[model samples]
Target: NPTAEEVLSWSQNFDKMMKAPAGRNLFREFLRTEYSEENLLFWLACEDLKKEQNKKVIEEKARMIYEDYISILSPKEVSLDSRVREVINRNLLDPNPHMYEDAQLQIYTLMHRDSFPRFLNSQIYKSFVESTAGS
Candidate 1:
């Protein structure tokens, strides 16, 4: 289903998708006529596939560490009542790490912070996370 031309077009489309106002209008027009329904469907499917792939990458990187830590700290076993330590440990010291120290420090940076209500108001973060969690 993949082709060099389609890949190239997707790259261009993604670039345009990131652009504001004018680019958004252009993409809407493109969707209205330039791209066929089947082609648009294929693009949507590819995007979904890419999202799952990314989720798997993150889980593979951290799930084992998370599960193990959770298991060790469960109600029957540990002195601590909360899972917060386990969560923090899994996040900070996972054997298969995804987030870096500098990246964690950069969490406070305006450029990196999640302005969900302001910037991602139209985006479906909960749906994405739940879908990935189900996966």
Candidate 2:
């Protein structure tokens, strides 16, 4: 019952839900199985980066994010075209918690428009809902 309601409720307002820890963990599980784990990882990294208070830590996390997700060489890079990529490169030079703001927003929108809809259509989601039925 709880599981079913959780999944149903999440599917209804997943964008807002994703900001919560439970929504992140559950959606991350789904994303990982679909081999799109990097999306959630990048989102989570941005979330963590936003909470940084120290300037030193801010710079370090910003670089870490750029290297991990923005760099084309990284295995788990997110899709960013030339324009946003150029902006990110410029932002990286100054390195702040908000450095990834545009990139993070793009990734979030991608997840909402692309991944979430596909996930909703999948047998996986239906099966999960079925399994959670009545308890």
Candidate 3:
């Protein structure tokens, strides 16, 4: 269970929820129930991509991310709009750290608008909030 402040922060915004490890874990569990955990995983991988400075490593990570989450053939493929998909395809050749920024934002917004509300209403989240209040 998370502390009152921790649980409360999640209710405030998607960014807050994702920033906390416990919140991310709980939300990931909720996403698992919805069979949409790939959204979160893709977002996490993109964040990791942004942190790399080595050009060789950046291209490698970029290709891996594309294969795992962007390719239509991937078992873990994430839902991305065609426009963003084109943007990704155009940028893939160069394989920069920011190549996936647009796609990442799309998925982030998708989760924020789609899954986030349900997460707040989930029995897991509600019960955690209740427990925090009692404490």
Candidate 4:
């Protein structure tokens, strides 16, 4: 489990060390301990929800997403101004494969710019790298 400095790099498609599953989970664990865990909560949910094709399922997932990440009532809500809520809600009226693209990218850029740099330096991240490196 080598710790790539770019483990938290801002951008680059396939090259991030903190790619997915294990890497993302460890990074998310670190973020949670620091109480800023909402970043990945919103970002990855969109990725997971993207492949939905059935009308009923998309509606279900869309509502879940709004409540999970967009509603003010959500403890795990992510940040975005009102302008984009309309984008999300408007898209909600129908199920498009790319429905959440704008909003997901919004959250992606947020973590990339704001929290990921800290993730690289976080003690939890450091410890995860060390423990996973027990080879």
Candidate 5:
């Protein structure tokens, strides 16, 4: 169950949808059905990386994110321009909290332009909106 206001706000924009943890979970589930949940997973991991303060933890998580999404061999590798990849490679040397910022932004923009419109029209989003509508 969810508040109508909460669920309805997602329709306003992708940022609104993702800002809500519940919305992210629902969107991730829907993306899984589309076989593209890695986008959200990578973005979520970047968000976590940004929130950490410990140098060691940031480096460790940065490696994990790189392995999971940046490595050409990883099954979940995301689509990124060579420039973004180049940026990430240099940032990996330092492994700071903001290391993945540009990569994350690219992915965020990709999702917003690609999957987001489809998500807006999906049965998953529609049913939730219907359930929460009226009153």
Candidate 6:
């Protein structure tokens, strides 16, 4: 499961990367790396290099998945269960962080309460599970 912070960070990173000139060059280089040498040379010969609307669509969908589904599912709170939620609240409510042992205890408590199902109801999880299950 992804944390909300992780989802926001990814979305911000993606946005920053797409907006940066260096990021565009790196993305092109990545495409070249994935393609065959001959194919890359052939495409380079044509000089048909332009960002397409389809790329924006892909990025938008990625952003939406991170923001709407992943962030919602793995919020930084115990919204699902009382006991597990209390543990989550205690760990995060403090301004200064607690000991690693306390963090581990909260993690174990959440695991014992089966918090994964709440996270797995998201679209990303559904897609992954269905694909793995051959559904």
Question: Where does candidate 5 stray beyond 4 Å?
Answer: 131-135
Question: Of the candidates numbered 4 and 5, which has the greater TM-score value?
Answer: 5
TM-score for each predicted model, relative to the true structure: 0.20, 0.86, 0.89, 0.81, 0.90, 0.22
Which rank order by TM-score, best down to worst? Answer: 5, 3, 2, 4, 6, 1
Kindly provide the TM-score of model 5 when superposed on the true structure, using C-alpha atoms: 0.90
lDDT of 3 by residue, 46-70 (tens): 9999999999999899999999999
Between candidates 2 and 4, the one scoring higher on lDDT is 2
Off by over 4 Å in 4: 1-15
Q: Pairing residues by index, what is the TM-score of model 6? A: 0.22
lDDT of 4 by residue, 46-132 (tens): 887888788787788878888888878998888886788888778877756577788887777877777777776778766665564
The lDDT values for all models are 0.34, 0.83, 0.89, 0.71, 0.89, 0.34
Query: Which of 1 and 3 is ahead in TM-score?
Result: 3
Worst 10 residues of 3 by lDDT: 126-135
Candidate 2 Cα errors over 4 Å, as ranges: 1-3, 130-134
Q: Write the per-residue lDDT of candidate 5 for residues 69-124, one digit (tens) a residue.
A: 99999999999999989988998889899888888999999989999888888998
Instruction: Report the error of model 1 at residue 58, Å.
Output: 16
Ranking by lDDT: 5, 3, 2, 4, 6, 1
Candidate 4 matches the true fold with a TM-score of: 0.81
Clashing residue pairs in candidate 1 (N, C-alpha, C atoms within 3 angstroms): none
Give candidate 6 misplaced runs (Cα > 4 Å).
Answer: 1-99, 111-114, 133-135
- TM-score winner, 2 or 6: 2
